[PDB]
Amino acid sequence: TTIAGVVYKDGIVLGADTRATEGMVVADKNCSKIHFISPNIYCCGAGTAADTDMTTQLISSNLELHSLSTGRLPRVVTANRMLKQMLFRYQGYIGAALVLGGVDVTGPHLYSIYPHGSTDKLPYVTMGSGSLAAMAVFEDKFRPDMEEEEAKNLVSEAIAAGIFNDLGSGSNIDLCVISKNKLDFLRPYTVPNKKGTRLGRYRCEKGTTAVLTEKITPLE
Amino acid sequence: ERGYSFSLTTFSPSGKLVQIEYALAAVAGGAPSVGIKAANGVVLATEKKQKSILYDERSVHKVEPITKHIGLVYSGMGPDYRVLVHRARKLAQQYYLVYQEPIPTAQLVQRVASVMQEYTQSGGVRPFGVSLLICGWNEGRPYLFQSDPSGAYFAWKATAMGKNYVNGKTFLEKRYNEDLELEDAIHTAILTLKESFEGQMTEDNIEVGICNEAGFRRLTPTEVKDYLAAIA
Amino acid sequence: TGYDLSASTFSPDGRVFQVEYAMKAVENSSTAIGIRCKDGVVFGVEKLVLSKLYEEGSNKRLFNVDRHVGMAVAGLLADARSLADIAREEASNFRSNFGYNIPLKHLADRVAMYVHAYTLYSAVRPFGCSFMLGSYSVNDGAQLYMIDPSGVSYGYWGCAIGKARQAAKTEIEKLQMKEMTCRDIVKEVAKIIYIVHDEVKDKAFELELSWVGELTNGRHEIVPKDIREEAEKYAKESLK
Amino acid sequence: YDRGVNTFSPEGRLFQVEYAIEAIKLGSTAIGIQTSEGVCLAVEKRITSPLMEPSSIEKIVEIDAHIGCAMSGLIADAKTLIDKARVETQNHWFTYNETMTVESVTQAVSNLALQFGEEDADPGAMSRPFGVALLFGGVDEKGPQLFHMDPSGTFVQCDARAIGSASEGAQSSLQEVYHKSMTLKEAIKSSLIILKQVMEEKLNATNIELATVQPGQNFHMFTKEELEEVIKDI
Amino acid sequence: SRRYDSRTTIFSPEGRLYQVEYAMEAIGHAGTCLGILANDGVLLAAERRNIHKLLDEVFFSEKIYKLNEDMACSVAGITSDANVLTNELRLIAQRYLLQYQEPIPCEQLVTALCDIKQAYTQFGGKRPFGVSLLYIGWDKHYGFQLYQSDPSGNYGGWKATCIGNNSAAAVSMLKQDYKEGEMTLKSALALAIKVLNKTMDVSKLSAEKVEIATLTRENGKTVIRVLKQKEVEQLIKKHEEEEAKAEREK
Amino acid sequence: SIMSYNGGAVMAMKGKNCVAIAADRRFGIQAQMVTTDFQKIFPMGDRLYIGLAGLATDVQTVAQRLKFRLNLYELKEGRQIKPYTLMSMVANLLYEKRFGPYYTEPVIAGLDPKTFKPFICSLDLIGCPMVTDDFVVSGTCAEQMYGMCESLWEPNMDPDHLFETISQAMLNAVDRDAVSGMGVIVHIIEKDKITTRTLKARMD
Amino acid sequence: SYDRAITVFSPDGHLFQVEYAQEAVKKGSTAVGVRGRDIVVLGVEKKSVAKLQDERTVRKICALDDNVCMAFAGLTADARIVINRARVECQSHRLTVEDPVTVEYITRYIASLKQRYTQSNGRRPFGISALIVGFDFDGTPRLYQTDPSGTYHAWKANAIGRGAKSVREFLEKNYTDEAIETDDLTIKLVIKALLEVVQSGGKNIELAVMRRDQSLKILNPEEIEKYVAEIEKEKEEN
Amino acid sequence: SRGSSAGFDRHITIFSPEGRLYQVEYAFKAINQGGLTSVAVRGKDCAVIVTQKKVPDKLLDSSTVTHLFKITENIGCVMTGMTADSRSQVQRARYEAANWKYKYGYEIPVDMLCKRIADISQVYTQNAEMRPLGCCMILIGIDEEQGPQVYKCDPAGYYCGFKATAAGVKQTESTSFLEKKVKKKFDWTFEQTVETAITCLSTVLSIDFKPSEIEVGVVTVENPKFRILTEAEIDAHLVALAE
């Protein structure tokens, strides 16, 4: 519930948390909040995870069809406009708030998309429940035309702040860098949180539990 | 728009779909193409004979991909090929959306066959005037499918559609091996294409696609002419 | 057969004989002429008097399709009425969707597209009517577009549709209509229509004449009666 | 095939409707007589074999308590129109608390008639015209009434009409023996004798269906005993 | 459209239906299909015509498909019609399975298919499906049971029947050499080999020219087994041996 | 609360290369128990089980429709279902009712048909894919089950220790829950067999 | 979308499509129906016995309810769909009336279906003539015959299909009131009527009988054999 | 003299015995029925469409009979065949281009527009209930990463990329002129391209056309909006080629 994106000197850097929770307890610590769309387009989704996943899948399929028909690389713009119109047709009932980053023929682009269908092209965007911490980090330590490592560190710090100041994000950070030339997608970018081992290991063997009936059906 | 509800394709007294036979005749009269299988991939080749060089032979493409792992070529009418490949792309995208896994080539060919059958048995339409050679890779295996305007399909290790297609088939049978490599498949395909080109093939006039475990990809004229030079 | 049965098929050469027969059906009808000048567009249409029991102004071949656009028709008059209804519907849609009166160029383009759209399917037949639309604007001037039953619309300094269309065109060529005065052009239209009318072929006849232009405050209207008699007298004198 | 369902003749009429009229004369013979004391309908059953039950062979149908109908032609096609007429009469009653007039029933039947085509309306519609001539006898506020419904939709109000296999000639003879001041008994006697004369086979109670509508009584169909009572004098 | 319609969904002056007649005639020269019933199973023999060496032949079966968990089908005629027919049959069989939580009876499924085929002949203006179907299956009510259906929409239940070329000769061979109620799987298989050898005498019995399928009921479970190429070779060898023995005894 | 209307508890964890999936057996209205032999784990393949939790009617309907489309797919395609494809297909099925969602949170467990690599995943009422290597749980017992698993689960477990762990997990997660329990059914899918067991749980 | 008028009036108002459907009915199999004073009997020639065939699936006599049954003559597939539609109509009537169905009403709505297919667009009528047997509420036997033209008429006895006219003309002269008093005489009459049609006489024939609301059953092959023997016994003495 | 026909093979677009579509191939000569020839060429950085302007009568406003249509700002087009069909195809192309612009956020590439129009034409060819729009369109544009582009659809629908082509009565003669010109010269600048475009029409049709007797459109990479040459430019190019 903490995703962010930024444009640096070359292209786009996207980052996301991993604490996918339903209700109030953590349901997963390895959510894939940075969806692939095109070899030059990624999008980070927040909100209803099923809706975000279906939206990203539909957009990826539509841009696959478009790019393969036109013989050109997909455009962040054609993705942003499709997302806008599709969400506006459903009047925001698709609980998906998206950060669409990519690199196209006209240059790197970053867009913020709201579930009602509103979109905006901004150099740095944050989204999700923990969006405010990352937004503050960006407002504090953002510069125009930053280097690759500077952008990576800035996004990492923003995700760390969102993780540590929100109760719906954590347990990992995912990064994806798109440029005019290279696309990197490093999921376990940095694991700022570890787990101590169980000090007293408690194991059981057969005969510790009571079973009523056994039914073996060997397969081949 | 009203739409005719009577099928233009009808059973002849002998039961033969003479309209489908005429469609296959149009396929034969169209530009020839060949497809061949290797032990680890599929190669599709075809010739694009335009008019005089005023046509930008580079601008237009004949070999077309459906997915990253499926490509195809046609023998027949380009107008039908465009709509057919567009619909096949839509079907593959819909399957990927539904099942979050790449389309199997067999299932894609089955869907294309169903579409062709719907065209042939429906009203107000014309049967498609193309024969599709479809290359695909999935589960670490190659697949090459013949699809006819009649709507049927087959898994063919080698095939040749168009003019002199029976002789191309015989030549492929003679020059086909069970355990050949992709290099041998390319040699055989280019050999058949030059044996049935009728007019001194060129790298621009030959367009080839290769499908293997790395996906489907169309060879650019550079390595195209490289292989023509290596094959003589 | 097979090449002249429907509008959805070509002749072995690639012709549309149904549209050619529509052209015949619009040619054999009564004459209808439209002359645009620098300060107006006039229409004079020839009315066949089947019997004197009819009213003057009955079965008008002149329709008023927009607040400023007229329509002089020839061919099947029921078809012409239907096309005038379609034209005024299109004008109403444009006015509703854009807040102002439709320009004649786009009006004619849309109507011709509609006419051509009913020349593609075997489920319909091409219109048996040709029609000239004249309009005026403060920024555009006087405009006149003629439209064929096939669906082709062109701007005409002066056009004629019907039997004596070519004769009307040729004798009116002496007029430099592109910079003439609408009032006197009305009288010259009366003249040309009287000469091109064949009294022996049609002993009984009537004239419906109208204009639209700057003198109309840019709204389509019929000729006032007094100008009607004066133009009739001029035409009688020109008959010699 | 080739010719459509909406095709006229060179002289300007539907040869499909002409064929329907021909099928009308191919139909069974029926007679209807309207008098000042009611109206009577009769029809020849045309029994094919004695095994066929006379009960299921009835060309006279009740539209309402005051309306009877005689059908000639495609008797299978006539029952759908009869059902429509009855439901329309009952709708009129449900709407206006009164029995539907016979003339309005006939007009509505005409509205249903000649409504068919290939692609002219909803696909679930008629393809061919009704091939049945009808005689609507009834009693309403205008006294006894009798209407000849032509499959053409040219409904007629007629005092007496004979239709079917022996329509013409028999109708002229019935007119000659018909008067403007006949009683109901005279009307039934005349209709019965004309039908007996025009019968193609030796008729009896099992060869004819008879019904009447009276100003006082409802629509009553003559059973066998009264049929024999009225036919023994003729 | 009156002149240019094909009007394939109307009657004929003599009362026949030319479209279904032509479909049956095309099926006659189409491939060979045979179905037979045994006391412990039902067997299918399908003949494949296009046998070019360029075939990948990776499929388990070409004209034999599996309609549902406990029923198999053999198609005769247009394979493209066969594919859409087969997946429609699978769809409706699974529909019955969903609706009743019970395997769909073979008679039920055949009646449904014949209903849809009859309606498609009845109207729609389209050329009928010129494919004959031969269904085998097992059910709670009748167990092993096989039907032959026609493009006209008519079906029949048989102990054994064949479609394709020399259909009359094949059915005569069945009527002569089928032991009703006493046909084991082995003797049924031998009769099937005999028919495959005889009803298509041109291009005498070949392993790759035909495909063989069996349907049995083991432990309350319907098992559909496609005999492999080595199995078909074993059948050919057994047929040759038995024919040689019969001729030598003759 | 609609998913707690009938109650439910399903879990699945991975072994060394085997899988364990377990479920409660109690079926009843919010208040009274009707049946204690209800089946909540259904085979979508020879080496692939699926557990469903939530509204009982939606469980049954979703299972029926899933088996429908799965059987159609496998008959059309000729291969046993791949677990990832099954999970994606059921997720799509749930998403098809975005405005009419089935109040069910399912889990899918099994082995790769050719690799036998353990696979487990979870969904929600909309059908959100959730693939987690260690374990996935669903039902009204969610908190108890998560707490149990996040300390009882270890990587690379033999089938017997896997069964013991999942059995203890279900027993000790349902004995502290009121709308679930009354018997636990456990399926252990090993490389070459499956073992179905009923635990000796408290029936009340 | 398919709405081409198939059934149109030919010259002289003759429905040539109806005539062709009648031709198909005539070319179809032979069936007969008798309405005895106590029972109703249907007899169908199982022509082309074609051994190794499960005749259960081809049985042309099908029961619609506990008191209604029908035997067709014509197209087997159209007969099957009409039987399905008649099952639908009988069940719908039973639901909406909670009373036993009526034979005449069933036949009437089937006739209305046939007439709708004659009057419909893009459709052809059902090339089958149906003999509907049944019993009313009071146990009154009912025998009706409907034709593809849509006309249905009640008959004491009749025949449809191949040889229908010859059989019905034989039955109109062989039919007497005292000849249908008991099931034995009714069965013998039907068997001797169909004997002139079927060459085998006993094995290419099938008989069904319905009593007054007594769960109609199909006649046993042994009963058919012994009754053909009985009619031969009558023949030798007469 | 026994003008027999083979049923409906020669009457509606159904498969002929020779594997041909008769009503599709009639469209090729339906193009010729228009009696007008339109020839388009592309330079290294420019594309020029040159089309003779027919004036059958002075009595019509010849200033309003211009047959060059701007599909978008940067896409111009010209058609041959039925003029009503040409107007309909121009309207459809404008609709599709605008729809692409809205649905995809950037101007439609000319190749994709031609592909869409060709698919729409294949719709007519496939269906047996519509006239297959016997009109040919040729469109121009300026494309990033690929340069100036000219495409041409057809009632049959088989389109292709090309340096130069023509549609009309003398399209074959224009094709021959293009063959000889490409075999003679290769390097083309803007003025050489426009001079060759004028030379094609002049050599092929041999009219010595007046300045008002043609209509010419150009797309250049200085203001990629499609712009139509007026009388001044027409006369300038005419005298430049003459000298």
PDB file of N, CA, C and O in Angstrom, chain A residues 27-29 49-51 54 93 195 198 202 204-206 210 212-215 217 219-220, chain F residues 47 95 98 128-130 132 146 150-152 160 164 191-198 200:
ATOM      1  N   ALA A  27      -1.713 -10.315   4.930  1.00  0.00           N
ATOM      2  CA  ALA A  27      -2.051 -11.520   4.182  1.00  0.00           C
ATOM      3  C   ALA A  27      -0.871 -12.058   3.383  1.00  0.00           C
ATOM      4  O   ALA A  27      -0.723 -13.276   3.242  1.00  0.00           O
ATOM      5  N   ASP A  28      -0.032 -11.176   2.845  1.00  0.00           N
ATOM      6  CA  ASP A  28       1.131 -11.586   2.076  1.00  0.00           C
ATOM      7  C   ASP A  28       2.253 -10.583   2.290  1.00  0.00           C
ATOM      8  O   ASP A  28       2.012  -9.388   2.472  1.00  0.00           O
ATOM      9  N   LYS A  29       3.490 -11.084   2.259  1.00  0.00           N
ATOM     10  CA  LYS A  29       4.670 -10.233   2.338  1.00  0.00           C
ATOM     11  C   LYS A  29       5.432 -10.171   1.022  1.00  0.00           C
ATOM     12  O   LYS A  29       6.532  -9.608   0.983  1.00  0.00           O
ATOM     13  N   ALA A  49      -6.412  -5.066  -4.706  1.00  0.00           N
ATOM     14  CA  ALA A  49      -5.320  -5.693  -5.441  1.00  0.00           C
ATOM     15  C   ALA A  49      -5.833  -6.493  -6.630  1.00  0.00           C
ATOM     16  O   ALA A  49      -5.196  -6.516  -7.689  1.00  0.00           O
ATOM     17  N   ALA A  50      -6.979  -7.159  -6.478  1.00  0.00           N
ATOM     18  CA  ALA A  50      -7.549  -7.903  -7.597  1.00  0.00           C
ATOM     19  C   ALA A  50      -7.911  -6.969  -8.746  1.00  0.00           C
ATOM     20  O   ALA A  50      -7.631  -7.263  -9.915  1.00  0.00           O
ATOM     21  N   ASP A  51      -8.536  -5.832  -8.428  1.00  0.00           N
ATOM     22  CA  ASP A  51      -8.877  -4.865  -9.464  1.00  0.00           C
ATOM     23  C   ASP A  51      -7.628  -4.316 -10.136  1.00  0.00           C
ATOM     24  O   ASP A  51      -7.590  -4.172 -11.363  1.00  0.00           O
ATOM     25  N   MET A  54      -6.199  -7.075 -12.467  1.00  0.00           N
ATOM     26  CA  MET A  54      -6.991  -7.225 -13.683  1.00  0.00           C
ATOM     27  C   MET A  54      -6.812  -6.032 -14.612  1.00  0.00           C
ATOM     28  O   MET A  54      -6.705  -6.200 -15.832  1.00  0.00           O
ATOM     29  N   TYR A  93     -15.448   2.685  -9.659  1.00  0.00           N
ATOM     30  CA  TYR A  93     -15.788   1.445  -8.971  1.00  0.00           C
ATOM     31  C   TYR A  93     -14.634   0.457  -8.974  1.00  0.00           C
ATOM     32  O   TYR A  93     -14.598  -0.440  -8.125  1.00  0.00           O
ATOM     33  N   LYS A 195      13.913 -11.412  10.188  1.00  0.00           N
ATOM     34  CA  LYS A 195      13.185 -12.166  11.200  1.00  0.00           C
ATOM     35  C   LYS A 195      14.175 -12.938  12.055  1.00  0.00           C
ATOM     36  O   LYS A 195      14.975 -13.720  11.531  1.00  0.00           O
ATOM     37  N   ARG A 198      13.435 -18.664  15.770  1.00  0.00           N
ATOM     38  CA  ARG A 198      12.754 -19.110  16.977  1.00  0.00           C
ATOM     39  C   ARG A 198      13.778 -19.602  17.990  1.00  0.00           C
ATOM     40  O   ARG A 198      14.509 -20.561  17.726  1.00  0.00           O
ATOM     41  N   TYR A 202      10.361 -26.090  18.571  1.00  0.00           N
ATOM     42  CA  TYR A 202       9.407 -27.077  19.062  1.00  0.00           C
ATOM     43  C   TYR A 202       8.855 -27.833  17.855  1.00  0.00           C
ATOM     44  O   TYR A 202       8.151 -27.277  17.010  1.00  0.00           O
ATOM     45  N   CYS A 204       7.433 -31.880  16.295  1.00  0.00           N
ATOM     46  CA  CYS A 204       6.678 -33.063  16.670  1.00  0.00           C
ATOM     47  C   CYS A 204       6.976 -34.183  15.686  1.00  0.00           C
ATOM     48  O   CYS A 204       7.435 -33.951  14.566  1.00  0.00           O
ATOM     49  N   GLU A 205       6.723 -35.408  16.133  1.00  0.00           N
ATOM     50  CA  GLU A 205       6.884 -36.603  15.326  1.00  0.00           C
ATOM     51  C   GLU A 205       5.565 -37.362  15.303  1.00  0.00           C
ATOM     52  O   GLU A 205       4.661 -37.093  16.099  1.00  0.00           O
ATOM     53  N   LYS A 206       5.451 -38.303  14.368  1.00  0.00           N
ATOM     54  CA  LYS A 206       4.257 -39.130  14.288  1.00  0.00           C
ATOM     55  C   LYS A 206       4.027 -39.844  15.614  1.00  0.00           C
ATOM     56  O   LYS A 206       4.969 -40.282  16.277  1.00  0.00           O
ATOM     57  N   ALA A 210      -3.151 -37.361  16.986  1.00  0.00           N
ATOM     58  CA  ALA A 210      -4.098 -38.463  16.903  1.00  0.00           C
ATOM     59  C   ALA A 210      -4.862 -38.382  15.588  1.00  0.00           C
ATOM     60  O   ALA A 210      -5.445 -37.342  15.265  1.00  0.00           O
ATOM     61  N   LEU A 212      -7.725 -40.382  12.935  1.00  0.00           N
ATOM     62  CA  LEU A 212      -8.844 -41.314  12.973  1.00  0.00           C
ATOM     63  C   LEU A 212      -8.783 -42.315  11.825  1.00  0.00           C
ATOM     64  O   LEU A 212      -8.970 -43.518  12.033  1.00  0.00           O
ATOM     65  N   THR A 213      -8.525 -41.841  10.608  1.00  0.00           N
ATOM     66  CA  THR A 213      -8.624 -42.684   9.426  1.00  0.00           C
ATOM     67  C   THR A 213      -7.528 -42.316   8.434  1.00  0.00           C
ATOM     68  O   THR A 213      -7.151 -41.151   8.297  1.00  0.00           O
ATOM     69  N   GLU A 214      -7.016 -43.334   7.741  1.00  0.00           N
ATOM     70  CA  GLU A 214      -6.022 -43.165   6.689  1.00  0.00           C
ATOM     71  C   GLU A 214      -6.537 -43.812   5.412  1.00  0.00           C
ATOM     72  O   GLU A 214      -7.144 -44.884   5.455  1.00  0.00           O
ATOM     73  N   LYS A 215      -6.290 -43.157   4.278  1.00  0.00           N
ATOM     74  CA  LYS A 215      -6.711 -43.657   2.969  1.00  0.00           C
ATOM     75  C   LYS A 215      -5.608 -43.357   1.957  1.00  0.00           C
ATOM     76  O   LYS A 215      -5.469 -42.217   1.505  1.00  0.00           O
ATOM     77  N   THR A 217      -4.203 -43.725  -1.741  1.00  0.00           N
ATOM     78  CA  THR A 217      -4.547 -44.022  -3.132  1.00  0.00           C
ATOM     79  C   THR A 217      -3.324 -43.737  -3.992  1.00  0.00           C
ATOM     80  O   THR A 217      -3.179 -42.618  -4.514  1.00  0.00           O
ATOM     81  N   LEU A 219      -0.725 -43.068  -6.851  1.00  0.00           N
ATOM     82  CA  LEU A 219      -0.868 -42.569  -8.207  1.00  0.00           C
ATOM     83  C   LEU A 219       0.314 -43.036  -9.054  1.00  0.00           C
ATOM     84  O   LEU A 219       1.189 -43.774  -8.589  1.00  0.00           O
ATOM     85  N   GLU A 220       0.346 -42.606 -10.310  1.00  0.00           N
ATOM     86  CA  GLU A 220       1.423 -42.981 -11.220  1.00  0.00           C
ATOM     87  C   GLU A 220       1.915 -41.780 -12.019  1.00  0.00           C
ATOM     88  O   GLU A 220       1.125 -41.072 -12.642  1.00  0.00           O
TER      89      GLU A 220
ATOM     90  N   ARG F  47      -3.171 -34.445  -8.952  1.00  0.00           N
ATOM     91  CA  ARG F  47      -2.204 -33.939  -7.989  1.00  0.00           C
ATOM     92  C   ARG F  47      -2.519 -32.484  -7.676  1.00  0.00           C
ATOM     93  O   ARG F  47      -1.615 -31.643  -7.626  1.00  0.00           O
ATOM     94  N   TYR F  95     -13.405 -12.943 -10.515  1.00  0.00           N
ATOM     95  CA  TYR F  95     -13.425 -11.551 -10.945  1.00  0.00           C
ATOM     96  C   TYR F  95     -14.588 -11.269 -11.885  1.00  0.00           C
ATOM     97  O   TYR F  95     -15.071 -10.133 -11.946  1.00  0.00           O
ATOM     98  N   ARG F  98     -17.463  -9.253 -10.304  1.00  0.00           N
ATOM     99  CA  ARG F  98     -16.982  -8.124  -9.513  1.00  0.00           C
ATOM    100  C   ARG F  98     -18.122  -7.412  -8.795  1.00  0.00           C
ATOM    101  O   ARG F  98     -17.989  -7.030  -7.627  1.00  0.00           O
ATOM    102  N   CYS F 128      -8.280 -12.274  -5.910  1.00  0.00           N
ATOM    103  CA  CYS F 128      -6.934 -11.723  -5.998  1.00  0.00           C
ATOM    104  C   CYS F 128      -5.894 -12.830  -5.897  1.00  0.00           C
ATOM    105  O   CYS F 128      -5.867 -13.549  -4.891  1.00  0.00           O
ATOM    106  N   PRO F 129      -5.025 -12.998  -6.890  1.00  0.00           N
ATOM    107  CA  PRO F 129      -3.969 -14.008  -6.774  1.00  0.00           C
ATOM    108  C   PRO F 129      -3.038 -13.686  -5.616  1.00  0.00           C
ATOM    109  O   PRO F 129      -2.632 -12.539  -5.421  1.00  0.00           O
ATOM    110  N   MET F 130      -2.696 -14.718  -4.845  1.00  0.00           N
ATOM    111  CA  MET F 130      -1.807 -14.551  -3.697  1.00  0.00           C
ATOM    112  C   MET F 130      -0.994 -15.834  -3.563  1.00  0.00           C
ATOM    113  O   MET F 130      -1.434 -16.783  -2.910  1.00  0.00           O
ATOM    114  N   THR F 132       2.119 -17.623  -2.054  1.00  0.00           N
ATOM    115  CA  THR F 132       3.075 -17.524  -0.962  1.00  0.00           C
ATOM    116  C   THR F 132       3.704 -18.890  -0.746  1.00  0.00           C
ATOM    117  O   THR F 132       2.996 -19.896  -0.658  1.00  0.00           O
ATOM    118  N   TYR F 146      -3.099 -18.038  10.690  1.00  0.00           N
ATOM    119  CA  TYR F 146      -1.876 -17.315  10.366  1.00  0.00           C
ATOM    120  C   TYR F 146      -0.893 -17.379  11.527  1.00  0.00           C
ATOM    121  O   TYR F 146       0.304 -17.633  11.334  1.00  0.00           O
ATOM    122  N   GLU F 150       2.773 -19.232  11.064  1.00  0.00           N
ATOM    123  CA  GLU F 150       3.989 -18.431  11.012  1.00  0.00           C
ATOM    124  C   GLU F 150       5.016 -18.845  12.057  1.00  0.00           C
ATOM    125  O   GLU F 150       6.083 -18.228  12.128  1.00  0.00           O
ATOM    126  N   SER F 151       4.718 -19.860  12.866  1.00  0.00           N
ATOM    127  CA  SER F 151       5.676 -20.412  13.806  1.00  0.00           C
ATOM    128  C   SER F 151       5.806 -21.922  13.709  1.00  0.00           C
ATOM    129  O   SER F 151       6.855 -22.459  14.077  1.00  0.00           O
ATOM    130  N   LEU F 152       4.776 -22.617  13.224  1.00  0.00           N
ATOM    131  CA  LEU F 152       4.847 -24.056  13.030  1.00  0.00           C
ATOM    132  C   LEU F 152       5.434 -24.469  11.692  1.00  0.00           C
ATOM    133  O   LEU F 152       5.882 -25.612  11.566  1.00  0.00           O
ATOM    134  N   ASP F 160       5.691 -36.706   6.452  1.00  0.00           N
ATOM    135  CA  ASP F 160       5.132 -37.057   7.753  1.00  0.00           C
ATOM    136  C   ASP F 160       5.147 -35.856   8.696  1.00  0.00           C
ATOM    137  O   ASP F 160       4.140 -35.554   9.352  1.00  0.00           O
ATOM    138  N   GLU F 164       1.987 -33.802  10.343  1.00  0.00           N
ATOM    139  CA  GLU F 164       1.879 -33.484  11.764  1.00  0.00           C
ATOM    140  C   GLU F 164       1.693 -31.987  11.976  1.00  0.00           C
ATOM    141  O   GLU F 164       0.832 -31.563  12.758  1.00  0.00           O
ATOM    142  N   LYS F 191       4.814 -37.171  -3.910  1.00  0.00           N
ATOM    143  CA  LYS F 191       5.200 -37.319  -5.310  1.00  0.00           C
ATOM    144  C   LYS F 191       4.384 -38.402  -6.004  1.00  0.00           C
ATOM    145  O   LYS F 191       3.998 -38.245  -7.168  1.00  0.00           O
ATOM    146  N   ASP F 192       4.106 -39.508  -5.307  1.00  0.00           N
ATOM    147  CA  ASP F 192       3.474 -40.648  -5.962  1.00  0.00           C
ATOM    148  C   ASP F 192       2.263 -41.190  -5.207  1.00  0.00           C
ATOM    149  O   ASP F 192       1.888 -42.349  -5.419  1.00  0.00           O
ATOM    150  N   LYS F 193       1.629 -40.389  -4.354  1.00  0.00           N
ATOM    151  CA  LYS F 193       0.424 -40.824  -3.659  1.00  0.00           C
ATOM    152  C   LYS F 193      -0.236 -39.619  -3.005  1.00  0.00           C
ATOM    153  O   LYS F 193       0.317 -38.516  -2.978  1.00  0.00           O
ATOM    154  N   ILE F 194      -1.443 -39.843  -2.495  1.00  0.00           N
ATOM    155  CA  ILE F 194      -2.156 -38.865  -1.683  1.00  0.00           C
ATOM    156  C   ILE F 194      -2.772 -39.593  -0.499  1.00  0.00           C
ATOM    157  O   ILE F 194      -3.341 -40.678  -0.656  1.00  0.00           O
ATOM    158  N   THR F 195      -2.644 -39.004   0.683  1.00  0.00           N
ATOM    159  CA  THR F 195      -3.190 -39.568   1.911  1.00  0.00           C
ATOM    160  C   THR F 195      -4.286 -38.649   2.429  1.00  0.00           C
ATOM    161  O   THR F 195      -4.052 -37.453   2.629  1.00  0.00           O
ATOM    162  N   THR F 196      -5.473 -39.206   2.644  1.00  0.00           N
ATOM    163  CA  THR F 196      -6.615 -38.468   3.166  1.00  0.00           C
ATOM    164  C   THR F 196      -6.894 -38.951   4.582  1.00  0.00           C
ATOM    165  O   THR F 196      -7.099 -40.149   4.803  1.00  0.00           O
ATOM    166  N   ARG F 197      -6.897 -38.022   5.534  1.00  0.00           N
ATOM    167  CA  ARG F 197      -7.039 -38.357   6.940  1.00  0.00           C
ATOM    168  C   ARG F 197      -8.090 -37.471   7.592  1.00  0.00           C
ATOM    169  O   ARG F 197      -8.290 -36.318   7.209  1.00  0.00           O
ATOM    170  N   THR F 198      -8.761 -38.031   8.590  1.00  0.00           N
ATOM    171  CA  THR F 198      -9.679 -37.288   9.439  1.00  0.00           C
ATOM    172  C   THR F 198      -9.075 -37.215  10.830  1.00  0.00           C
ATOM    173  O   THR F 198      -8.734 -38.245  11.418  1.00  0.00           O
ATOM    174  N   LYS F 200      -8.750 -36.520  14.908  1.00  0.00           N
ATOM    175  CA  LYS F 200      -9.574 -36.799  16.083  1.00  0.00           C
ATOM    176  C   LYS F 200      -9.747 -35.503  16.867  1.00  0.00           C
ATOM    177  O   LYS F 200      -9.193 -35.306  17.949  1.00  0.00           O
TER     178      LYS F 200
END
